[PDB]
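Why do we bother with a discrete structure alphabet at all? Because it lets us treat a fold like text: something you can write down, compare, and reason about line by line. To make this less abstract, here is a complete entry for Alpha-conotoxin AnIB. Read it the way you would read a sentence in a foreign language you are learning: slowly, and without expecting to understand everything at once.
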Amino acid sequence: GGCCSHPACAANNQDYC
């Protein structure tokens, strides 16, 4: 997860999500 708690981050989480 990591930064994926933030929807705006999760959408751009190429390495995390």
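What the structure line is telling us, in plain words: The two ends are 7 Å apart (CA to CA). Residues 7-10 form the longest helix (4 residues).
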